[PDB]
DNA sequence: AGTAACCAATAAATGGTATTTAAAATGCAAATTATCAGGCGTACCCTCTTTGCGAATTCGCGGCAGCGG
């Protein structure tokens, strides 16, 4: 229920992703192949129980939550 | 005050094939205490004596026994 539970650090990169980041640039950026970039971001989708990012972007920013 | 599905394009849509990461936790077998379980010994003198009293008045039957011509 709670997203505190993963990292924060991973979080920040995550709101960086929702602000129009490329899996390519991430990678680059990241220091990982392109797979493990899409793992990660499918991870969150799951984690977040979420089927498209802007829901949870929006839901997020609306509260202020983090 | 606005028609398109044209053909490329964009990466996101997944759920699937693995060598990793070390931390944890989870088990594992030692050391190290308590406590239990056996053995021995005892120097005034003491000497068959306790029992069962009756698996309790059955009875009827059988037979293997000792005495006996």
């Given at each position: 229920?709670d997203?505190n539970?993963?990292?924060?650090?991973?979080?920040?990169?995550?709101?960086?992703?929702?602000?129009?980041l490329?899996?390519?640039?991430?990678?680059?950026?990241?220091?990982?192949?392109?797979?493990?970039?899409?793992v990660?971001?499918?991870?969150?989708?799951?984690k977040?129980?979420?089927?498209?990012?802007?829901?949870?972007?929006?839901?997020?920013?609306?509260?202020?939550?983090?």
């Amino acid at each position: 229920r709670d997203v505190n539970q993963l990292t924060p650090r991973e979080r920040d990169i995550l709101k960086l992703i929702a602000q129009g980041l490329p899996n390519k640039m991430i990678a680059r950026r990241l220091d990982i192949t392109e797979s493990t970039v899409k793992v990660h971001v499918k991870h969150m989708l799951k984690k977040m129980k979420l089927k498209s990012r802007v829901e949870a972007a929006v839901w997020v920013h609306q509260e202020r939550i983090f």
